Amino acid sequence: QRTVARDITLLECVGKGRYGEVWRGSWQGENVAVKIFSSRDEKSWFRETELYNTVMLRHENILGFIASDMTSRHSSTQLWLITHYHEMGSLYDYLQLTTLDTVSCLRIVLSIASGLAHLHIEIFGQGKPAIAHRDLKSKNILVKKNGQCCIADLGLAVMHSPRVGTKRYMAPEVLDETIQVDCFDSYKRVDIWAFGLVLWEVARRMVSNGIVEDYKPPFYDVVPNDPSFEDMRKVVCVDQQRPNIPNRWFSDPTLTSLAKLMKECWYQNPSARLTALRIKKTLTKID
Ligand SMILES: COc1cc(-c2cncc(-c3ccc(C4CCN(C)CC4)cc3)c2C)cc(OC)c1OC
Ligand SMILES: COc1cc(-c2cncc(-c3ccc(C4CCN(C)CC4)cc3)c2C)cc(OC)c1OC
Ligand SMILES: COc1cc(-c2cncc(-c3ccc(C4CCN(C)CC4)cc3)c2C)cc(OC)c1OC
């Protein structure tokens, strides 16, 4: 019987953080991405592994799973997650340098909405539990060669049948600790808030009438870098600020429709926010 080639050549590091590292790797000529977890973030490996052991997600707008590997070392355990490799990198990276036209902007945001609705929706029978992401942001979205994106990092995901989200993207009910933690719909509504911020980040980079905004992260003008939980709560909960919509958007029918969409992701009342399925429908009718 058979040879099980497990050797993965780590070729270059494309990411280093408190999470650990991501490497471009090669298995059998074929490019893979290898996330090597820090000790700090072991529970993210376990959670993503537990989810994929429960349901083998397969969707064009979800980063493709290849393998979870645990290897015993002299005095530690090494944890690797192996996925598809997207050489264009994260949406965060991509937006820094690249501007968008109407077609690319819509393709990006509809692909993200598609991936998010896929996570959110329970399918009965080759089915899946409903899933909420809990850390949606432009660094957790990859740009594919075909212009569509895919959602990455299910390390905080929750399923329905001490890692917390990135503070800059936390919904008001997370910051004021009123979120109903027993309620699955609560977690979907937290993802819709974060989606609305991502839609703002992308829409800024769409050119209209020769104008584009510089890349900025959500709330760049009202909080410091690495904003505290308190910094965010005062802006989002107490003062009820929302990202600025520039005047130039209201000359462009695509950006006018997207400003309305992002407004309906940012209601203080979580139950007033649009669903991912309703966002998809709205986006298919733009242009
Ligand atoms: C263990 O570890 C790793 C394994 C592999 C890997 C390498 N060659 C072949 C395989 C393979 C897949 C599937 C079957 C089927 C065929 C027969 N059918 C009736 C049931 C079983 C057999 C063999 C795998 C899974 C790659 C890895 O990394 C890319 C591994 O490390 C994470
Ligand atoms: C993990 O990832 C990759 C794995 C492989 C790979 C290697 N050996 C064998 C296999 C295999 C063969 C046959 C079955 C069976 C299942 C039962 N049914 C009755 C018929 C089909 C399953 C598995 C695969 C899938 C290739 C890959 O890329 C080319 C992988 O991606 C990097
Ligand atoms: C968010 O999360 C995960 C992401 C990935 C992932 C998948 N494809 C590609 C990448 C990537 C490749 C290349 C660049 C740069 C380097 C070269 N040049 C300067 C431009 C582009 C950036 C990023 C990553 C980081 C894998 C993961 O796990 C294995 C992730 O975690 C789940």
Taking every pair of Cα atoms in the chain, the longest distance, rounded to a whole number of angstroms, is 67
Among 121, 214, 136, residue whose Cα is nearest residue 170:
136
Cβ–ligand 1 contact at 4 (below 6 Å): yes
Catalytically annotated residue among 69, 135, 182, 214: 135
How far apart are the C-alpha atoms of 250 and 246, rounded to whole Å?
8
How far apart are the C-alpha atoms of 24 and 10, rounded to whole Å?
6
Centroid of ligand 2 to alpha carbon of 61 (angstroms): 22
How far apart are the C-alpha atoms of 115 and 41, rounded to whole Å?
24
Gap sites in the chain (C to N > 2.5 Å), preceding residue numbers: 125, 161
According to the annotation, is 22 in a ligand binding site? Answer: yes
Resolution in Å, one decimal place: 1.4
Q: Three-class SS of residue 105?
A: helix
Show contacts of 11-18: CB within 8 Å, 24+ apart. Answer: 14/89
Residues contacting 284, CB < 8 A, separation 6+? 110
Cβ–ligand 3 contact at 153 (below 6 Å): yes
Among 285, 235, 277, residue whose Cα is nearest residue 258:
285
Centroid of ligand 1 to alpha carbon of 63 (angstroms): 20
How far apart are the C-alpha atoms of 190 and 197, rounded to whole Å?
11
How far apart are the C-alpha atoms of 279 and 286, rounded to whole Å?
11
How far apart are the C-alpha atoms of 218 and 117, rounded to whole Å?
22
SS3 for 197-241 is: HHHHHHHHCECECCECCCCCCCCCCCCCCCCCHHHHHHHHHHCCC
According to the annotation, is 137 in a ligand binding site? Answer: no
